[PDB]
Amino acid sequence: MWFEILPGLAIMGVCLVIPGVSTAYIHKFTNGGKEKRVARVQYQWYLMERDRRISGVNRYYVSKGLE
């Protein structure tokens, strides 16, 4: 019947979720489990950069009250 148009769709869907799940986990892996900071405006880039300088070289590492 119409049962059969589903096979094809399944392979479309599966190929349209990969991208959204992929981009959203290759970010939380590269950024240390914390969402990649979105620096829309400079202030944010400043804060981000400030973070880099604060520790290691990468901003994702985040020092706390114990420092």
Binding site: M12, L16, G20, I26, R40
Partner: protein, 317 residues
């Protein structure tokens, strides 16, 4: 990593792009009382790969045509389509272009060059007419297409597609602004030269002006482009107007929901094609410079006043 994130977001879309043609040649089929392609492979799954290989193997005829432009137009087409998928705001978008919607609008406009140049390069009368007709309709639908977005943005606060995920945390922008959704949907149908608005390659009226002389590999690249676009524009409808649910804890839900709505609205233009005859050239443009453009202009004002008199100006984050 970033490279891997380029394979994903590309291949996956290309593989899905292939499966759309199949779900087009079966959904149109069952609507017309026919199984559609099921004999090659299981349930026709290998069917998209099969003609791709035939198309590339068949001779790329070079008519006795400006070669450079003739060959470039296809390249531009695909380049643009794949590019327009870069800033889409599925969760954690590949690239947070701060002015993304503008970027989308920009690249979308550049595509017109392909059809125009293709027709001019083809050097065939049919192609020439196709280009002229195409450029006109394309650009015109761009004029309402852009204004419809400007109305949206003013209620979103920014050009970044990522903001709408925070704008649509309580209600879809269809409820408000539904009148434009319809007008975004019809314009999305024109800009992908799909059926109700497909005078670019009417085939019956004029025979595929865009690719009259294009065959094999060039045919395929635009071809691929059109279908990827078919998805992209539907996906933009599924972010701007139908806002999928989103949860910071679980970012996947968005993608999954984004999938479902994109597939259904992608299914809709497939369903539109089989269901409607094709608008005439004059009729098409009238609808936009006459039936819609006045509608789109006025609501723009209403959407300018709305925030103010409702003191509903959006945050600029």
């Amino acid at each position: 990593m970033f490279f891997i994130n380029i394979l994903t977001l590309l291949v996956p879309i290309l593989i899905a792009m292939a499966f759309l043609t199949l779900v087009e040649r079966k959904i149109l089929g069952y609507m017309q009382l026919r199984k559609g392609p099921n004999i090659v492979g299981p349930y026709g799954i290998l069917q998209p790969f099969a003609d791709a290989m035939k198309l590339f193997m068949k001779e790329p005829m070079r008519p006795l045509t400006s070669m450079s432009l003739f060959i470039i137009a296809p390249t531009l087409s695909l380049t643009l389509a794949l590019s327009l998928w870069v800033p889409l705001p599925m969760p954690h978008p590949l690239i947070n272009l701060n002015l993304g919607i503008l970027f989308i609008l920009a690249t979308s406009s550049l595509s017109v060059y392909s059809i125009l140049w293709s027709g001019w390069a083809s050097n065939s009368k049919y192609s020439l007419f196709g280009a002229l007709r195409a450029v006109a309709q394309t650009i015109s639908y761009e004029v309402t297409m852009a204004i419809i977005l400007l109305s949206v943005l003013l209620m979103n606060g920014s050009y970044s597609l990522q903001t709408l995920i925070t704008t649509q945390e309580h209600m879809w922008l269809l409820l408000p602004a539904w009148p434009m959704a319809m007008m975004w949907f019809i314009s999305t149908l024109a800009e992908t030269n799909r059926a109700p608005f497909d005078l670019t390659e009417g085939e019956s009226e004029l025979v595929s002006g865009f690719n009259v002389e294009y065959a094999a590999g060039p045919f395929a690249l635009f071809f691929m482009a059109e279908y990827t676009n078919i998805i992209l524009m539907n996906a933009l409808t599924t972010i701007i107007f139908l806002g999928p649910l989103y949860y910071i804890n679980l970012p996947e839900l968005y993608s999954t929901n984004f999938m479902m709505e994109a597939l259904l609205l992608s299914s809709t233009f497939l369903w539109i094609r089989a269901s409607y005859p094709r608008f005439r050239y004059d009729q098409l443009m009238h609808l936009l410079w006459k039936n819609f453009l006045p509608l789109t202009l006025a609501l723009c004002m209403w959407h300018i006043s709305l925030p103010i008199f409702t003191a509903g100006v959006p945050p600029y984050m």
